[PDB]
Amino acid sequence: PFMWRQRAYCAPVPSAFASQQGVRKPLLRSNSESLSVFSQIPDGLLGHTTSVTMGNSDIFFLPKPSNLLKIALPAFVFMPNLTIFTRAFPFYAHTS
Amino acid sequence: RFYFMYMARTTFQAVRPLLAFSVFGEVMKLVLATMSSGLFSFLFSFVLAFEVFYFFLQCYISYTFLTMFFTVLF
Amino acid sequence: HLYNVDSTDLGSAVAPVRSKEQLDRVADSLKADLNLPGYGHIPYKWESLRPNPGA
Amino acid sequence: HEQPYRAFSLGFTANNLSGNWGDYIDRQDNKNALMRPARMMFTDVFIPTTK
Amino acid sequence: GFHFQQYIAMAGRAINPVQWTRAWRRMEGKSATEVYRDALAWTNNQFAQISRASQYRAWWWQNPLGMGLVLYGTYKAWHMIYMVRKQKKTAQLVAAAYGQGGQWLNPVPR
Amino acid sequence: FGPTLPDHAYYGEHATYNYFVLFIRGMRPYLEKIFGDCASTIKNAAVAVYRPVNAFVVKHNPDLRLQFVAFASFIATHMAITKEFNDMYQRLVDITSLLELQA
Amino acid sequence: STSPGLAFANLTLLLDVPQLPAIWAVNAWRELNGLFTEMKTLAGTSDLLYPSNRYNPQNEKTNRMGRPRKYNHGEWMFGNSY
Amino acid sequence: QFWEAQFANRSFFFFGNAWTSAAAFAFFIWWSRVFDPPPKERLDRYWLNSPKFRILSAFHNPGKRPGLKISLMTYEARYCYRGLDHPFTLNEMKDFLFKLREQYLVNKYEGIQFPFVFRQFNRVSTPGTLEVHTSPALQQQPHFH
Amino acid sequence: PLGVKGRSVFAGMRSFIGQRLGRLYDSFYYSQSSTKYVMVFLFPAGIFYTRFRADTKLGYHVFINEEKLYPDYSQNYFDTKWTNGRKVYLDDETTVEQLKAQIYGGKAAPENVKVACRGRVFEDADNVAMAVRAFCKRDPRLLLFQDNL
Amino acid sequence: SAQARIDPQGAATKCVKWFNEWRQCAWDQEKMVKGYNYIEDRRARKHKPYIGAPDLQYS
Amino acid sequence: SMDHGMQYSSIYWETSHRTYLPFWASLTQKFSWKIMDDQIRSFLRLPKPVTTEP
Amino acid sequence: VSFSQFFDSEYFWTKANVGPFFLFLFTSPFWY
Amino acid sequence: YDNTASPKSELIFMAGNALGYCTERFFENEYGQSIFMFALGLAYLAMLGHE
Numbered sequence A: 001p002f003m004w005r006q007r008a009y010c011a012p013v014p015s016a017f018a019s020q021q022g023v024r025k026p027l028l029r030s031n032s033e034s035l036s037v038f039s040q041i042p043d044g045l046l047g048h049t050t051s052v053t054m055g056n057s058d059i060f061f062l063p064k065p066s067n068l069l070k071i072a073l074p075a076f077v078f079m080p081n082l083t084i085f086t087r088a089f090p091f092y093a094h095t096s
Numbered sequence B: 001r002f003y004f005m006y007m008a009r010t011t012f013q014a015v016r017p018l019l020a021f022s023v024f025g026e027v028m029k030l031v032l033a034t035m036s037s038g039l040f041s042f043l044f045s046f047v048l049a050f051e052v053f054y055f056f057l058q059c060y061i062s063y064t065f066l067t068m069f070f071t072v073l074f
Numbered sequence C: 001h002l003y004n005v006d007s008t009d010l011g012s013a014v015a016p017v018r019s020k021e022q023l024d025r026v027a028d029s030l031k032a033d034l035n036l037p038g039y040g041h042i043p044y045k046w047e048s049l050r051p052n053p054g055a
Numbered sequence D: 001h002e003q004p005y006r007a008f009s010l011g012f013t014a015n016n017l018s019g020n021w022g023d024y025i026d027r028q029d030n031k032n033a034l035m036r037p038a039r040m041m042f043t044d045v046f047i048p049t050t051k
Numbered sequence E: 001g002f003h004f005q006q007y008i009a010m011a012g013r014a015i016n017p018v019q020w021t022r023a024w025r026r027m028e029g030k031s032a033t034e035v036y037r038d039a040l041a042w043t044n045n046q047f048a049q050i051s052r053a054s055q056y057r058a059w060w061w062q063n064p065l066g067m068g069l070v071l072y073g074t075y076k077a078w079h080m081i082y083m084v085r086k087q088k089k090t091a092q093l094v095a096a097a098y099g100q101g102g103q104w105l106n107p108v109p110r
Numbered sequence F: 001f002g003p004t005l006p007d008h009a010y011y012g013e014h015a016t017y018n019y020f021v022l023f024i025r026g027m028r029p030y031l032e033k034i035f036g037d038c039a040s041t042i043k044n045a046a047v048a049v050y051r052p053v054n055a056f057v058v059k060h061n062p063d064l065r066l067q068f069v070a071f072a073s074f075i076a077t078h079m080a081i082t083k084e085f086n087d088m089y090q091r092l093v094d095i096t097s098l099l100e101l102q103a
Numbered sequence G: 001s002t003s004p005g006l007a008f009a010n011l012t013l014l015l016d017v018p019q020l021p022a023i024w025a026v027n028a029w030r031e032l033n034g035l036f037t038e039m040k041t042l043a044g045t046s047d048l049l050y051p052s053n054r055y056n057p058q059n060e061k062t063n064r065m066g067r068p069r070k071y072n073h074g075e076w077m078f079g080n081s082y
Numbered sequence H: 001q002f003w004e005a006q007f008a009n010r011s012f013f014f015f016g017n018a019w020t021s022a023a024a025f026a027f028f029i030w031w032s033r034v035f036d037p038p039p040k041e042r043l044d045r046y047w048l049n050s051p052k053f054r055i056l057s058a059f060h061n062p063g064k065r066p067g068l069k070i071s072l073m074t075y076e077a078r079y080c081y082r083g084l085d086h087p088f089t090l091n092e093m094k095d096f097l098f099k100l101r102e103q104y105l106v107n108k109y110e111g112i113q114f115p116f117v118f119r120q121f122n123r124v125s126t127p128g129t130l131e132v133h134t135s136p137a138l139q140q141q142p143h144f145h
Numbered sequence I: 001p002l003g004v005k006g007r008s009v010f011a012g013m014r015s016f017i018g019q020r021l022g023r024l025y026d027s028f029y030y031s032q033s034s035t036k037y038v039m040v041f042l043f044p045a046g047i048f049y050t051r052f053r054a055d056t057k058l059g060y061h062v063f064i065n066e067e068k069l070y071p072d073y074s075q076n077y078f079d080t081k082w083t084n085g086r087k088v089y090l091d092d093e094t095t096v097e098q099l100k101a102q103i104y105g106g107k108a109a110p111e112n113v114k115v116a117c118r119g120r121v122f123e124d125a126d127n128v129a130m131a132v133r134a135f136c137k138r139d140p141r142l143l144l145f146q147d148n149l
Numbered sequence J: 001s002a003q004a005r006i007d008p009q010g011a012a013t014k015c016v017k018w019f020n021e022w023r024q025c026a027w028d029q030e031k032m033v034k035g036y037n038y039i040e041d042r043r044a045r046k047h048k049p050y051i052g053a054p055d056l057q058y059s
Numbered sequence K: 001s002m003d004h005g006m007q008y009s010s011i012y013w014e015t016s017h018r019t020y021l022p023f024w025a026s027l028t029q030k031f032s033w034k035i036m037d038d039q040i041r042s043f044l045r046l047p048k049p050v051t052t053e054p
Numbered sequence L: 001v002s003f004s005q006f007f008d009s010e011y012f013w014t015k016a017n018v019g020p021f022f023l024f025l026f027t028s029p030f031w032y
Numbered sequence M: 001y002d003n004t005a006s007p008k009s010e011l012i013f014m015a016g017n018a019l020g021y022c023t024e025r026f027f028e029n030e031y032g033q034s035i036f037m038f039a040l041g042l043a044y045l046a047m048l049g050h051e
């Protein structure tokens, strides 16, 4: 509230300088309202727009013809076997 | 520190083929985008084939190191 | 003279009732007041036997 | 912990790390200068301009 | 692989509407289990023909890669006919909704 | 001052006949009982739900063509009701968009 | 046993499975705090209590944000100003 | 088979490198939370800027532009489910107003396209006799020296 | 032959728990004193304390504007100098005065010292938690400065 | 500093951010003075992305 | 000279970029529980929001 | 059937149907 | 303001924070669905090889 001619974002809209226009719309409005989203537009369906959900579409099906294969295939190890040597695991886990 | 060393080695051996397939592919794509004539293209086809063979070599190396790193006695 | 009103009736004391007809009326009034050539124009629509793909 | 993340796509076939498309306002070409004249070659479908 | 021409002809008959009435009449006194078993048996008959006849017979398309090339060609045809078409449609959709490349835009800066 | 610890305190257990494998092979009967009872309960419930429905459907649509007709009509009715609800919500959304345009 | 390729899982386990007791303790403490809050609410309060909120400082001389209440020096015919 | 493998040595649940071990590891990561959808308090971390989300929104709003509604969904996710009274910074406010302006222009001018709004479509309307001319040279501005 | 008549599954559970506890005591007794005490009491205790404090209390990163306002930590050990960005865990009832005293070691603090978050000054008779909730939501970085003006 | 006397538009382009921060602080001060709070909902089932992750408490 | 403009930029799809749409996507459609929830609230006399009061 | 004669080991492991009991036990978090 | 230190005792949260980052960035989105399909495929291949 100090530099009015230099701070136009805090100034009234040009329709306010015009001296002409149940309940009526306000006569005085500022440009600082542009810094708010729901100043002029309504807040309708504000907290209900993230609730419109749609399901995924992936199908987990792939025929598994094993009659074509006669050899084994390599397989990964995902976790260490804690059912054996459980008490020493923190002590031998760092080795190889 | 051994866990960090091991994970670094594992990730490098796992991404080696991805690198060979992606970054060298980008280089080949640059060359394709820039080249127009026929002699250079004739000579560059062989570079592409060499990249094929190199990708397969990297895949073999990664398979070897991964079967070494994911082999457990018990 | 203390209030910014044209008349003394400030509207009903209860909210409206949900009505497809009232919604259509308000939407048509807003469209007429805006007068925007370009509303409802669809430059590209997903090709399908269905009129509205998706919605 | 309040800044948002950029989408991640990585595979043997495609990725989203070799380029940057920019923001919604400040956009930029994802392909670099050497391959911009050959953009057609990096597409499965291409619909040209009207002129 | 084999009988691609017969498969095209089957698709044609299927799209022909008169065949829809013919199938409606044939479905009188019929069960879903029977239909499913018949289709599964047809597919098995095709694959069994392949498995048996590949041992002694060679098609006009025989090549040093065998049926692998025919299967790759089937896959590539499916790809270019269906998936690339869907990609074209999705591209036009994205270009009308956000602009070209709109699905790969960075998040709004904070 | 000598050894204070026994050998089993250090040496690892047998590789193929170990504590956990023996324990789980001993628990196998109880686990079989438990999981079989649970699965039987679930299956009996699902069957009690499915038998009457399949009967009521076949009693009125005994043929494949009739079953297909009923399935298609069900799909169409579901889609139509969903479309009614969606039309209402779309009218709301259209009003909001018009107010944004007005702003 | 283990291997270099299992370094991720080994580290994760070693650093996480010891935290499960603490996680369960935190959950139990939260349950007990909720129980005490609900018992206090049932007993009665001058101003309301927000259950799922971190802190509730409101009383007869304090706002719901830790500041003194305005216009609370006198008494009101309708009772509490809230 | 899966049940029998549990009592065999080195094949209990996800331990080992058997197929049953792979299946149990898959079920374990499914039973975990890491692959479940994010909550509303976290949607705007990744999901609202996602290609799948954008494409789905565009597809299920056939002839519309959901940029503005996405901005508003972000505002919601940050205000109503995370507790932020000021969700938008200056950049986000500018983006919202940019999308609002684009909506206005699109509904005002029929067929407006890229140079003025971020939008491209192929089936355009042309006059019939389209003239092609060279643009005028850039205006000479006065300069010192 | 599963189960016995007259015995209860709860009695079986009790017996099993007794067996487990006895085995644990035996294994702890026949173990190295160099490793067992540590691995069983000191690492669990520290991990428990850290996790509980992090998941229950709420912390703030404290900074100070100028070096002349730094406290005097020359006497106390393990911290002979102030470092900005320090994580400080507090209770929900803590005020700005209590925070200031905790920072300056219950000793005479400088004059006109005040706390700010995201550029917004706090009152001294204000709850830190609520003031942060109001001014800097989910950005608890506090700054101590001198307000002469 | 931006010389708004002779470049008002250019300077406002720089200072509107501090104006916006002042606006926010005004609202915050008002809501602290007049006790304004809201009913927060219960904690979400996946508040933590990973069980081993710490859930840092925020006021 | 702004309405009915020509295609100024090219439209394309980069190789192997995903689409995330199945073959029944066109038959798929959206839905919100808000209308049904409002009906149920009105029928069961559940707490109304204050926006009902002008 | 009574509580005691149900939770007796013999009847609990031989003749009883512990399906519902163990299902309730597994789903306890849901009910809580 | 970005020199936000933290107690050295919180280094135990290393793997927790790593997994949380990987979850918020990859696992709980479409790339995470692809990773889940990759795990299912590992199971598929193991079963195929056994048979």
Ligand SMILES: CCCCCCCCCCCCCCCCCC(=O)OC[C@H](COP(=O)([O-])OCC(O)COP(=O)([O-])OC[C@@H](COC(=O)CCCCCCCCCCCCCCCCC)OC(=O)CCCCCCCCCCCCCCCCC)OC(=O)CCCCCCCCCCCCCCCCC
Pocket (backbone or CB within 6 Å): C047, C048, C049, C050, E004, E007, E008, E011, E015, E035, E036, E039, E040, E073, E074, E075, E077, E078, E081, E082, K023, K024, K025, K026, K027
């Ligand atoms: C040789 C192998 C066999 C070949 C034949 C296979 C094809 C059979 C299908 C034939 C029917 C086609 C329909 C024609 C009528 C016009 C409609 C139309 O075509 O639009 C569809 C589409 C374009 O659609 P659009 O432009 O978006 O507009 C409307 C939409 O389509 C539609 O509107 P919408 O979006 O609203 O609809 C949504 C929804 C509607 O549909 C649905 O919702 C569900 C539909 C699924 C129904 C499932 C069956 C129901 C079963 C019920 C019973 C169950 C129990 C019994 C069964 C148990 C099973 C064990 O989804 C769909 O649309 C599904 C459409 C599927 C398209 C066909 C996909 C196959 C592509 C070609 C594969 C080629 C393979 C390799 C060939 C190798 C040859 C060398 O175009 C095509 O699909 C083209 C088909 C071309 C067939 C080519 C056959 C090979 C010929 C080779 C020629 C050589 C040159 C080829 C180049 C490569 C050479 C190497």
Ligand SMILES: CCCCCCCCCCCCCCCCCC(=O)OC[C@H](COP(=O)([O-])OCC(O)COP(=O)([O-])OC[C@@H](COC(=O)CCCCCCCCCCCCCCCCC)OC(=O)CCCCCCCCCCCCCCCCC)OC(=O)CCCCCCCCCCCCCCCCC
Pocket (backbone or CB within 6 Å): E002, E003, E004, E005, E006, E008, E060, E061, E070, E071, E073, E074, E076, E077, E080
């Ligand atoms: C355009 C090509 C590019 C396509 C799109 C790009 C796709 C790339 C992916 C490629 C994937 C390929 C799919 C591999 C899966 C296996 C397919 C397979 O082996 O069986 C195919 C299938 C053979 O069925 P099959 O189960 O082996 O039983 C054979 C019969 O028993 C009959 O027994 P047969 O002993 O009497 O004869 C056996 C066989 C003999 O096949 C051969 O050995 C080829 C004979 C000539 C040697 C040189 C071939 C290349 C240059 C000449 C042919 C140009 C067309 C390209 C043909 C590519 C296939 C080799 O018959 C044929 O396949 C006839 C194919 C030639 C039809 C020519 C139609 C001309 C119309 C187009 C205008 C001219 C071309 C325009 C320029 C195109 C440049 C790309 O061939 C058919 O298309 C059946 C046609 C049924 C009548 C349809 C109504 C007439 C429409 C004519 C077009 C038919 C579609 C062909 C589209 C290509 C022409 C536009």
Ligand SMILES: CCCCCCCCCCCCCCCCCC(=O)OC[C@H](COP(=O)([O-])OCC(O)COP(=O)([O-])OC[C@@H](COC(=O)CCCCCCCCCCCCCCCCC)OC(=O)CCCCCCCCCCCCCCCCC)OC(=O)CCCCCCCCCCCCCCCCC
Pocket (backbone or CB within 6 Å): A057, A058, A061, A062, A063, A064, A065, E001, E002, E014, E043, E046, E047, E075, E082, E083, E086, K017, K018, K019, K020, K021, K022, K023, M034, M037, M038, M041, M042
């Ligand atoms: C070298 C490496 C080795 C090591 C392996 C390392 C990797 C290990 C890990 C595993 C890999 C994980 C990697 C991460 C994956 C993430 C990416 C991803 O998955 O999606 C990407 C990719 C991205 O697509 P997008 O654009 O993002 O769209 C995503 C949508 O969600 C999806 O798009 P969409 O929904 O549009 O596509 C689905 C598509 C296909 O969907 C299906 O078809 C459903 C699947 C059913 C399969 C069973 C039916 C088989 C029937 C065969 C009978 C043919 C006749 C027999 C002829 C014999 C002689 C040849 O639908 C259609 O195109 C139209 C078909 C509609 C009808 C389907 C329902 C009816 C089925 C019955 C036919 C009835 C026809 C009646 C006609 C009407 C008459 C009135 O997704 C896809 O492309 C999905 C389709 C992929 C198909 C690939 C084609 C090759 C399949 C073979 C694979 C290898 C086989 C191995 C041997 C086993 C077979 C023998």
Ligand SMILES: CCCCCCCCCCCCCCCCCC(=O)OC[C@H](COP(=O)([O-])OCC(O)COP(=O)([O-])OC[C@@H](COC(=O)CCCCCCCCCCCCCCCCC)OC(=O)CCCCCCCCCCCCCCCCC)OC(=O)CCCCCCCCCCCCCCCCC
Pocket (backbone or CB within 6 Å): D009, D010, D011, D012, D013, D014, E068, E071, E072, E074, E075, E078, K015, K016, K017, K018, M022, M026, M031, M034, M035, M036, M038
């Ligand atoms: C801050 C630090 C951050 C650091 C980074 C951190 C990173 C994050 C955290 C990471 C944590 C680690 C997590 C693990 C890593 C994650 C990896 C991951 O999730 O993947 C994501 C990533 C994908 O994620 P995305 O976001 O969706 O990427 C974009 C899409 O992928 C784009 O899709 P697209 O447009 O490119 O389309 C691709 C297309 C690709 O489709 C194809 O490639 C299929 C082509 C088949 C052609 C021939 C088919 C013949 C069959 C005919 C059947 C009968 C006729 C029926 C006719 C209809 C069917 C044709 O669709 C598919 O991918 C289909 C996949 C589903 C089917 C899988 C089939 C597996 C079969 C395996 C067979 C095993 C045989 C063993 C025999 C051993 C030898 C004795 O993975 C990929 O790289 C995708 C490509 C994967 C390669 C699959 C290739 C399979 C090819 C099998 C060929 C078999 C032929 C064998 C012949 C040899 C014997 C003669």
Ligand SMILES: CCCCCCCCCCCCCCCCCC(=O)OC[C@H](COP(=O)([O-])OCC[N+](C)(C)C)OC(=O)CCCCCCCCCCCCCCCCC
Pocket (backbone or CB within 6 Å): F027, F030, F031, F034, I001, I002, I003, I004, I007, I008, I009, I010, I011, I012, I013, I015, I016, I017, L025, L026
């Ligand atoms: C809830 C989710 C669980 C899912 C994952 C777990 C797998 C699901 C299957 C159920 C798991 C439990 C299987 C137990 C099998 C053991 C049966 C058995 O007979 O064991 C021998 C015991 C001892 O029997 P006994 O020695 O007294 O008499 C019989 C003697 N013999 C065997 C020689 C004939 O029998 C029992 O009393 C029943 C014990 C099982 C009941 C308890 C379940 C254990 C799991 C909880 C662990 C914590 C215990 C403390 C609980 C305190 C409760 C307040």
Ligand SMILES: CCCCCCCCCCCCCCCCCC(=O)OC[C@H](COP(=O)([O-])OCC[N+](C)(C)C)OC(=O)CCCCCCCCCCCCCCCCC
Pocket (backbone or CB within 6 Å): A082, A086, A087, A088, A089, A090, A091, F009, F010, G013, G017, I024, I025, I027, I028, I029, I030, I031, I032, I033, I035, I036, I039, I040
């Ligand atoms: C989805 C999750 C799947 C993963 C599985 C998650 C659940 C299972 C995870 C288990 C894996 C981790 C297990 C590591 C265990 C290591 C702990 C340990 O063994 O301790 C080190 C010590 C080390 O002993 P050590 O040093 O002599 O020898 C260790 C190994 N070497 C020889 C190589 C050095 O182990 C013990 O000796 C005791 C272990 C049993 C006691 C366990 C703690 C409870 C003790 C309570 C009794 C207290 C009595 C107090 C009496 C005081 C007066 C005497």
Ligand SMILES: CCCCCCCC/C=C/CCCCCCCC(=O)OC[C@H](COP(=O)(O)OCCN)OC(=O)CCCCCCC/C=C/CCCCCCCC
Pocket (backbone or CB within 6 Å): A076, A077, A078, A079, B010, B011, B014, G005, G008, G009, G012, G013, G016, G017, H028, H029, H031, H032, H033, H034, J050, J051, J052, M035, M038, M039
């Ligand atoms: C090329 C090298 C690649 C190596 C990468 C492999 C990563 C392997 C590490 C993953 C396993 C780590 C074990 C973590 C256990 C943590 C301790 C624990 O027990 O916590 C249990 C906890 C479950 O708790 P809740 O979520 O609360 O359950 C709620 C039920 N509704 O477990 C989990 O969270 C699951 C953890 C998921 C790990 C991340 C999954 C990564 C996907 C890997 C598969 C892709 C292929 C990987 C390559 C294979 C390499 C052999």
Ligand SMILES: CCCCCCCCCCCCO[C@@H]1O[C@H](CO)[C@@H](O[C@H]2O[C@H](CO)[C@@H](O)[C@H](O)[C@H]2O)[C@H](O)[C@H]1O
Pocket (backbone or CB within 6 Å): B015, B018, B019, B022, B023, B026, D010, D015, D017, D018, D019, D030, D031, D032, D033
């Ligand atoms: C996780 C890592 C391992 C997996 C690797 C995944 C694929 C790697 C991506 C391709 C690497 C090369 O990528 C190539 O260099 C950079 C990538 O930013 C881009 O280059 C572009 O961005 C950089 C920004 O750093 C600019 O300096 C440059 O002027 C511009 O042309 C090129 O357009 C791209 O072709």
Ligand SMILES: CCCCCCCCCCCCO[C@@H]1O[C@H](CO)[C@@H](O[C@H]2O[C@H](CO)[C@@H](O)[C@H](O)[C@H]2O)[C@H](O)[C@H]1O
Pocket (backbone or CB within 6 Å): G027, G028, G030, G031, G032, G033, G034, G035, G051, G052, G053, J042, J043, J044, J045
């Ligand atoms: C002996 C005490 C009981 C021991 C058993 C403890 C089991 C507790 C773990 C169950 C899962 C809890 O997970 C989560 O934590 C607490 C309840 O605990 C709830 O948290 C929410 O409600 C509680 C009420 O109790 C409030 O104090 C809290 O402010 C709020 O965030 C979440 O709604 C719940 O989803």
